Design an enzyme around this catalytic site. Sequence first.
Site, PDB file in Angstrom:
ATOM      1  N   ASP A 266      10.285  -0.526  -3.882  1.00 52.44           N
ATOM      2  CA  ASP A 266      10.021  -1.976  -3.856  1.00 52.44           C
ATOM      3  C   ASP A 266      10.940  -2.780  -4.784  1.00 52.44           C
ATOM      4  O   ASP A 266      11.033  -4.015  -4.667  1.00 52.44           O
ATOM      5  CB  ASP A 266       8.548  -2.305  -4.121  1.00 52.44           C
TER       6      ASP A 266
ATOM      7  N   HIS B 199      14.503   7.408  -5.640  1.00 56.23           N
ATOM      8  CA  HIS B 199      14.689   7.390  -4.179  1.00 56.23           C
ATOM      9  C   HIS B 199      15.597   6.237  -3.728  1.00 56.23           C
ATOM     10  O   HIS B 199      15.619   5.890  -2.558  1.00 56.23           O
ATOM     11  CB  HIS B 199      13.349   7.301  -3.453  1.00 56.23           C
TER      12      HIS B 199
ATOM     13  N   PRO C 110       0.821  -1.206   0.000  1.00 57.81           N
ATOM     14  CA  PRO C 110       0.000   0.000   0.000  1.00 57.81           C
ATOM     15  C   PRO C 110       0.855   1.256   0.000  1.00 57.81           C
ATOM     16  O   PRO C 110       2.007   1.224   0.450  1.00 57.81           O
ATOM     17  CB  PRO C 110      -0.792  -0.102   1.320  1.00 57.81           C
ATOM     18  N   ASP C 111       0.301   2.351  -0.508  1.00 57.40           N
ATOM     19  CA  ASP C 111       0.939   3.645  -0.347  1.00 57.40           C
ATOM     20  C   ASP C 111       1.280   3.865   1.137  1.00 57.40           C
ATOM     21  O   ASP C 111       0.426   3.643   2.013  1.00 57.40           O
ATOM     22  CB  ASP C 111       0.022   4.745  -0.862  1.00 57.40           C
ATOM     23  N   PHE C 112       2.518   4.286   1.415  1.00 60.10           N
ATOM     24  CA  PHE C 112       2.997   4.410   2.802  1.00 60.10           C
ATOM     25  C   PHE C 112       2.066   5.342   3.573  1.00 60.10           C
ATOM     26  O   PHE C 112       2.022   5.293   4.797  1.00 60.10           O
ATOM     27  CB  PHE C 112       4.451   4.949   2.912  1.00 60.10           C
ATOM     28  N   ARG C 113       1.336   6.187   2.848  1.00 65.86           N
ATOM     29  CA  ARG C 113       0.448   7.177   3.451  1.00 65.86           C
ATOM     30  C   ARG C 113      -0.997   6.707   3.622  1.00 65.86           C
ATOM     31  O   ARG C 113      -1.806   7.407   4.218  1.00 65.86           O
ATOM     32  CB  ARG C 113       0.446   8.483   2.661  1.00 65.86           C
TER      33      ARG C 113
ATOM     34  N   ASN D  25       9.347   4.505  -6.690  1.00 67.67           N
ATOM     35  CA  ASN D  25       9.216   3.361  -5.799  1.00 67.67           C
ATOM     36  C   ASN D  25      10.544   2.793  -5.321  1.00 67.67           C
ATOM     37  O   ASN D  25      11.558   2.856  -6.031  1.00 67.67           O
ATOM     38  CB  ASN D  25       8.410   2.236  -6.441  1.00 67.67           C
TER      39      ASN D  25
HETATM   40  C1  LIG Z   1      11.129  10.931   0.321  1.00 65.79           C
HETATM   41  S1  LIG Z   1      12.789  10.431   0.518  1.00 65.79           S
HETATM   42  O1  LIG Z   1      13.570  10.620  -0.601  1.00 65.79           O
HETATM   43  O2  LIG Z   1      13.507  11.387   1.475  1.00 65.79           O
HETATM   44  N1  LIG Z   1      12.940   8.928   1.239  1.00 65.79           N
HETATM   45  C2  LIG Z   1      12.938   7.835   0.381  1.00 65.79           C
HETATM   46  C3  LIG Z   1      11.775   6.878   0.656  1.00 65.79           C
HETATM   47  C4  LIG Z   1      10.557   7.316  -0.131  1.00 65.79           C
HETATM   48  C5  LIG Z   1      10.339   6.333  -1.200  1.00 65.79           C
HETATM   49  C6  LIG Z   1       9.170   6.784  -2.009  1.00 65.79           C
HETATM   50  N2  LIG Z   1       8.019   7.010  -1.136  1.00 65.79           N
HETATM   51  C7  LIG Z   1       6.736   6.326  -1.006  1.00 65.79           C
HETATM   52  N3  LIG Z   1       5.665   6.982  -0.462  1.00 65.79           N
HETATM   53  C8  LIG Z   1       4.449   6.368  -0.345  1.00 65.79           C
HETATM   54  N4  LIG Z   1       4.281   5.122  -0.795  1.00 65.79           N
HETATM   55  C9  LIG Z   1       5.299   4.403  -1.371  1.00 65.79           C
HETATM   56  C10 LIG Z   1       5.247   2.995  -1.938  1.00 65.79           C
HETATM   57  C11 LIG Z   1       6.539   2.652  -2.446  1.00 65.79           C
HETATM   58  C12 LIG Z   1       6.900   1.419  -3.062  1.00 65.79           C
HETATM   59  N5  LIG Z   1       5.860   0.534  -3.524  1.00 65.79           N
HETATM   60  O3  LIG Z   1       8.091   1.144  -3.225  1.00 65.79           O
HETATM   61  S2  LIG Z   1       7.621   3.935  -2.214  1.00 65.79           S
HETATM   62  C13 LIG Z   1       6.570   5.020  -1.501  1.00 65.79           C
HETATM   63  C14 LIG Z   1       8.174   7.972  -0.068  1.00 65.79           C
HETATM   64  C15 LIG Z   1       9.385   7.600   0.745  1.00 65.79           C
END
Ligand SMILES: CS(=O)(=O)NCCC1CCN(c2ncnc3cc(C(N)=O)sc23)CC1
Length: 274
Positions: free
Chosen positions: A112, A129, A36-39, A110
Amino acid sequence: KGKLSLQDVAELIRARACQRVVVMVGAGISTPSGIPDFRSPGSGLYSNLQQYDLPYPEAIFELPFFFHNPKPFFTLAKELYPGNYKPNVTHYFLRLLHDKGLLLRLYTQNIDGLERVSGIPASKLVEAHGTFASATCTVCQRPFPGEDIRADVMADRVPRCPVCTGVVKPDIVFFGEPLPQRFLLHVVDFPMADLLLILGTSLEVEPFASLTEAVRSSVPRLLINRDLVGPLAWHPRSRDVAQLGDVVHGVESLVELLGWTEEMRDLVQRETGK
Ligand SMILES: CS(=O)(=O)NCCC1CCN(c2ncnc3cc(C(N)=O)sc23)CC1
Ligand code: NA
Ligand SMILES: [Zn+2]
Protein backbone atom coordinates in the site's frame (compact mmCIF):
# COMPACT_ATOMS: atom_id res chain seq x y z
CA LYS A 1 13.28 -9.88 36.76
CA GLY A 2 10.87 -12.18 34.91
CA LYS A 3 8.34 -10.77 32.42
CA LEU A 4 8.78 -7.32 30.91
CA SER A 5 5.60 -5.27 30.62
CA LEU A 6 4.60 -2.85 27.89
CA GLN A 7 5.38 -0.19 30.52
CA ASP A 8 8.94 -1.49 30.84
CA VAL A 9 9.37 -1.26 27.06
CA ALA A 10 8.10 2.33 27.07
CA GLU A 11 10.54 3.24 29.89
CA LEU A 12 13.39 1.76 27.88
CA ILE A 13 12.39 4.04 24.98
CA ARG A 14 11.77 7.09 27.21
CA ALA A 15 15.29 6.58 28.62
CA ARG A 16 16.66 6.19 25.06
CA ALA A 17 18.12 2.88 26.25
CA CYS A 18 16.53 1.62 23.01
CA GLN A 19 17.27 3.96 20.11
CA ARG A 20 18.03 1.47 17.30
CA VAL A 21 14.54 0.06 16.77
CA VAL A 22 13.86 -2.39 13.96
CA VAL A 23 10.19 -2.62 12.93
CA MET A 24 8.41 -5.42 11.02
CA VAL A 25 4.88 -4.85 9.70
CA GLY A 26 2.29 -6.68 7.59
CA ALA A 27 -1.33 -6.52 6.43
CA GLY A 28 -2.77 -6.00 9.93
CA ILE A 29 -1.51 -2.42 10.26
CA SER A 30 -3.43 -1.23 7.18
CA THR A 31 -6.88 -2.80 7.63
CA PRO A 32 -7.98 0.40 9.52
CA SER A 33 -7.02 2.49 6.46
CA GLY A 34 -9.69 0.61 4.47
CA ILE A 35 -7.42 -2.11 3.00
CA PRO A 36 -8.47 -5.65 3.94
CA ASP A 37 -6.08 -8.58 3.97
CA PHE A 38 -6.09 -9.86 0.35
CA ARG A 39 -7.10 -13.23 1.84
CA SER A 40 -10.09 -12.02 3.85
CA PRO A 41 -13.23 -13.91 2.71
CA GLY A 42 -15.80 -11.55 1.22
CA SER A 43 -13.90 -8.23 1.15
CA GLY A 44 -10.31 -9.30 0.28
CA LEU A 45 -8.76 -8.71 -3.14
CA TYR A 46 -8.45 -12.50 -3.71
CA SER A 47 -12.20 -13.04 -3.27
CA ASN A 48 -13.07 -10.20 -5.66
CA LEU A 49 -11.94 -11.80 -8.93
CA GLN A 50 -14.90 -10.47 -10.89
CA GLN A 51 -14.23 -6.78 -10.11
CA TYR A 52 -10.58 -6.99 -11.22
CA ASP A 53 -11.45 -9.26 -14.21
CA LEU A 54 -9.16 -12.06 -12.92
CA PRO A 55 -9.19 -15.79 -13.91
CA TYR A 56 -7.74 -16.81 -10.48
CA PRO A 57 -6.28 -14.82 -7.53
CA GLU A 58 -2.52 -15.19 -8.05
CA ALA A 59 -2.71 -14.14 -11.73
CA ILE A 60 -2.69 -10.48 -10.65
CA PHE A 61 0.95 -11.00 -9.59
CA GLU A 62 2.09 -13.36 -12.31
CA LEU A 63 4.41 -12.27 -15.13
CA PRO A 64 2.96 -14.40 -17.98
CA PHE A 65 -0.62 -13.35 -17.15
CA PHE A 66 0.51 -9.72 -16.84
CA PHE A 67 2.09 -9.85 -20.31
CA HIS A 68 -1.12 -11.41 -21.64
CA ASN A 69 -3.31 -8.84 -19.90
CA PRO A 70 -1.92 -6.02 -17.73
CA LYS A 71 -5.31 -4.37 -17.03
CA PRO A 72 -6.30 -6.25 -13.85
CA PHE A 73 -2.96 -5.38 -12.21
CA PHE A 74 -3.29 -1.75 -13.35
CA THR A 75 -6.76 -1.62 -11.75
CA LEU A 76 -5.14 -2.56 -8.44
CA ALA A 77 -2.36 -0.04 -9.12
CA LYS A 78 -4.87 2.76 -9.69
CA GLU A 79 -6.49 1.88 -6.32
CA LEU A 80 -3.21 1.51 -4.38
CA TYR A 81 -1.33 4.48 -5.88
CA PRO A 82 -0.44 7.25 -3.36
CA GLY A 83 -3.28 9.61 -2.47
CA ASN A 84 -6.19 7.16 -2.33
CA TYR A 85 -5.72 5.54 1.09
CA LYS A 86 -4.83 7.30 4.34
CA PRO A 87 -2.16 6.07 6.75
CA ASN A 88 -3.56 5.47 10.22
CA VAL A 89 -2.32 5.88 13.84
CA THR A 90 -0.07 2.82 13.51
CA HIS A 91 1.72 4.42 10.55
CA TYR A 92 2.08 7.77 12.30
CA PHE A 93 3.57 6.12 15.40
CA LEU A 94 6.31 4.64 13.18
CA ARG A 95 6.74 8.13 11.67
CA LEU A 96 7.15 9.65 15.15
CA LEU A 97 9.66 6.91 15.96
CA HIS A 98 11.62 8.08 12.97
CA ASP A 99 11.28 11.79 13.83
CA LYS A 100 12.69 11.19 17.31
CA GLY A 101 15.78 9.45 15.85
CA LEU A 102 14.93 5.95 17.16
CA LEU A 103 14.10 4.02 13.97
CA LEU A 104 16.95 1.94 12.55
CA ARG A 105 14.75 0.24 9.91
CA LEU A 106 11.13 -0.45 8.98
CA TYR A 107 10.63 -3.76 7.14
CA THR A 108 7.21 -3.92 5.47
CA GLN A 109 5.47 -6.79 3.65
CA ASN A 110 2.77 -4.33 2.55
CA ILE A 111 2.44 -2.80 -0.91
CA ASP A 112 0.00 0.00 0.00
CA GLY A 113 3.05 2.30 0.36
CA LEU A 114 1.49 3.91 3.46
CA GLU A 115 4.82 4.03 5.31
CA ARG A 116 6.20 6.35 2.56
CA VAL A 117 2.93 8.30 2.59
CA SER A 118 3.27 8.88 6.36
CA GLY A 119 6.57 10.68 5.69
CA ILE A 120 9.11 7.98 6.56
CA PRO A 121 12.11 8.36 4.22
CA ALA A 122 12.87 5.62 1.67
CA SER A 123 16.33 4.91 3.20
CA LYS A 124 14.57 3.83 6.42
CA LEU A 125 12.25 1.41 4.57
CA VAL A 126 12.68 -2.12 3.36
CA GLU A 127 9.69 -2.76 1.12
CA ALA A 128 10.05 -6.50 0.88
CA HIS A 129 7.41 -7.16 -1.84
CA GLY A 130 8.22 -3.96 -3.75
CA THR A 131 6.46 -0.65 -4.24
CA PHE A 132 4.27 1.52 -6.50
CA ALA A 133 6.71 4.44 -5.96
CA SER A 134 8.83 3.30 -8.88
CA ALA A 135 8.38 1.35 -12.14
CA THR A 136 10.56 -0.57 -14.61
CA CYS A 137 10.19 -1.23 -18.35
CA THR A 138 9.52 -4.96 -18.76
CA VAL A 139 11.64 -5.11 -21.94
CA CYS A 140 14.76 -2.87 -21.49
CA GLN A 141 14.80 -2.45 -17.64
CA ARG A 142 14.63 1.34 -17.85
CA PRO A 143 13.50 2.75 -14.46
CA PHE A 144 10.77 5.37 -13.96
CA PRO A 145 9.60 7.31 -10.90
CA GLY A 146 6.03 6.18 -10.13
CA GLU A 147 4.87 9.74 -10.82
CA ASP A 148 5.96 9.35 -14.48
CA ILE A 149 3.28 6.75 -15.27
CA ARG A 150 0.55 8.21 -12.97
CA ALA A 151 -1.48 10.01 -15.67
CA ASP A 152 -1.64 6.78 -17.75
CA VAL A 153 -2.55 4.80 -14.58
CA MET A 154 -5.34 7.24 -13.61
CA ALA A 155 -6.71 7.27 -17.19
CA ASP A 156 -6.74 3.45 -17.58
CA ARG A 157 -3.94 3.52 -20.18
CA VAL A 158 -1.18 0.88 -20.07
CA PRO A 159 2.04 2.95 -19.73
CA ARG A 160 4.69 2.37 -22.43
CA CYS A 161 8.49 2.82 -22.56
CA PRO A 162 9.67 5.90 -24.60
CA VAL A 163 12.72 3.84 -25.70
CA CYS A 164 11.38 0.41 -26.69
CA THR A 165 7.59 0.75 -26.41
CA GLY A 166 7.58 -2.11 -23.84
CA VAL A 167 4.96 -2.13 -21.05
CA VAL A 168 6.22 -0.28 -17.93
CA LYS A 169 5.42 -2.20 -14.70
CA PRO A 170 5.34 -0.84 -11.11
CA ASP A 171 8.09 -2.37 -8.98
CA ILE A 172 5.90 -4.95 -7.27
CA VAL A 173 7.65 -8.29 -6.76
CA PHE A 174 5.78 -10.90 -8.88
CA PHE A 175 5.70 -14.68 -8.39
CA GLY A 176 9.10 -16.31 -8.86
CA GLU A 177 10.99 -13.01 -9.00
CA PRO A 178 13.86 -12.20 -6.63
CA LEU A 179 13.24 -10.25 -3.41
CA PRO A 180 14.41 -6.63 -3.70
CA GLN A 181 18.15 -6.07 -3.13
CA ARG A 182 17.51 -3.76 -0.16
CA PHE A 183 16.20 -6.79 1.75
CA LEU A 184 19.86 -7.78 2.35
CA LEU A 185 20.10 -4.82 4.71
CA HIS A 186 18.71 -7.40 7.16
CA VAL A 187 22.19 -8.94 7.52
CA VAL A 188 23.49 -5.77 9.22
CA ASP A 189 20.20 -4.43 10.65
CA PHE A 190 19.23 -7.29 12.94
CA PRO A 191 22.49 -7.86 14.92
CA MET A 192 22.40 -4.08 15.47
CA ALA A 193 18.77 -3.75 16.70
CA ASP A 194 18.36 -2.87 20.39
CA LEU A 195 14.58 -3.33 20.11
CA LEU A 196 12.38 -5.42 17.77
CA LEU A 197 8.88 -4.17 17.07
CA ILE A 198 6.35 -6.40 15.24
CA LEU A 199 3.00 -4.88 14.23
CA GLY A 200 -0.02 -6.43 12.53
CA THR A 201 1.73 -9.57 11.31
CA SER A 202 2.45 -12.95 12.86
CA LEU A 203 5.56 -13.37 10.67
CA GLU A 204 4.66 -17.00 9.98
CA VAL A 205 6.14 -17.26 6.51
CA GLU A 206 9.83 -17.46 5.53
CA PRO A 207 11.99 -15.50 4.98
CA PHE A 208 10.45 -13.22 7.65
CA ALA A 209 9.93 -15.92 10.28
CA SER A 210 13.68 -16.45 10.74
CA LEU A 211 14.40 -12.72 11.08
CA THR A 212 12.53 -12.72 14.42
CA GLU A 213 15.35 -14.96 15.81
CA ALA A 214 18.15 -12.82 14.31
CA VAL A 215 18.13 -10.13 17.05
CA ARG A 216 20.44 -10.68 20.06
CA SER A 217 19.26 -12.66 23.13
CA SER A 218 19.08 -9.51 25.25
CA VAL A 219 16.91 -7.59 22.75
CA PRO A 220 13.25 -7.18 23.74
CA ARG A 221 10.75 -8.25 21.11
CA LEU A 222 7.42 -6.48 21.32
CA LEU A 223 4.49 -8.03 19.39
CA ILE A 224 1.48 -5.83 18.78
CA ASN A 225 -1.00 -8.11 17.07
CA ARG A 226 -4.45 -9.58 17.50
CA ASP A 227 -2.98 -12.87 18.62
CA LEU A 228 0.19 -14.45 19.87
CA VAL A 229 0.84 -16.85 17.02
CA GLY A 230 3.81 -17.47 14.74
CA PRO A 231 7.56 -17.73 15.61
CA LEU A 232 7.21 -15.50 18.68
CA ALA A 233 4.67 -17.89 20.15
CA TRP A 234 6.59 -20.92 18.90
CA HIS A 235 9.82 -19.86 20.63
CA PRO A 236 9.27 -17.35 23.46
CA ARG A 237 12.22 -15.44 24.90
CA SER A 238 12.52 -13.99 28.42
CA ARG A 239 12.43 -10.42 27.15
CA ASP A 240 9.38 -10.80 24.83
CA VAL A 241 6.25 -8.72 25.34
CA ALA A 242 2.86 -9.30 23.69
CA GLN A 243 0.16 -6.66 23.44
CA LEU A 244 -2.79 -8.56 22.01
CA GLY A 245 -6.02 -7.36 20.49
CA ASP A 246 -6.70 -4.43 18.21
CA VAL A 247 -3.39 -3.06 16.85
CA VAL A 248 -4.58 0.59 16.96
CA HIS A 249 -5.58 0.16 20.62
CA GLY A 250 -2.21 -1.55 21.31
CA VAL A 251 -0.33 1.34 19.70
CA GLU A 252 -2.40 4.03 21.46
CA SER A 253 -1.68 2.25 24.77
CA LEU A 254 2.07 2.36 24.10
CA VAL A 255 1.84 6.00 22.93
CA GLU A 256 0.09 6.84 26.23
CA LEU A 257 2.82 5.17 28.30
CA LEU A 258 5.51 6.94 26.23
CA GLY A 259 3.85 10.29 26.91
CA TRP A 260 3.43 11.00 23.18
CA THR A 261 -0.40 11.29 22.98
CA GLU A 262 -0.27 15.01 22.12
CA GLU A 263 2.63 14.94 19.71
CA MET A 264 0.75 12.01 18.06
CA ARG A 265 -2.45 14.04 17.75
CA ASP A 266 -0.54 17.04 16.30
CA LEU A 267 0.98 14.67 13.73
CA VAL A 268 -2.17 12.68 12.85
CA GLN A 269 -3.61 16.21 12.59
CA ARG A 270 -1.69 18.11 9.88
CA GLU A 271 -1.03 14.94 7.90
CA THR A 272 -4.71 13.90 7.55
CA GLY A 273 -5.34 17.35 6.02
CA LYS A 274 -3.03 16.61 3.07
C1 LIG B 1 3.82 -12.83 -2.47
S1 LIG B 1 4.67 -12.03 -3.76
O1 LIG B 1 5.94 -11.61 -3.42
O2 LIG B 1 5.04 -13.05 -4.84
N1 LIG B 1 3.74 -10.89 -4.55
C2 LIG B 1 3.77 -9.61 -4.03
C3 LIG B 1 2.39 -9.13 -3.57
C4 LIG B 1 2.15 -9.56 -2.14
C5 LIG B 1 2.20 -8.35 -1.30
C6 LIG B 1 2.02 -8.76 0.12
N2 LIG B 1 0.80 -9.56 0.25
C7 LIG B 1 -0.47 -9.31 0.93
N3 LIG B 1 -1.26 -10.37 1.30
C8 LIG B 1 -2.45 -10.16 1.95
N4 LIG B 1 -2.84 -8.92 2.26
C9 LIG B 1 -2.09 -7.81 1.94
C10 LIG B 1 -2.39 -6.36 2.25
C11 LIG B 1 -1.33 -5.54 1.74
C12 LIG B 1 -1.24 -4.13 1.83
N5 LIG B 1 -2.09 -3.43 2.76
O3 LIG B 1 -0.42 -3.52 1.14
S2 LIG B 1 -0.16 -6.51 0.99
C13 LIG B 1 -0.85 -8.00 1.27
C14 LIG B 1 0.70 -10.77 -0.54
C15 LIG B 1 0.95 -10.41 -1.99
NA1 NA C 1 -7.49 -11.98 -22.68
ZN1 LIG D 1 11.87 -0.05 -22.56
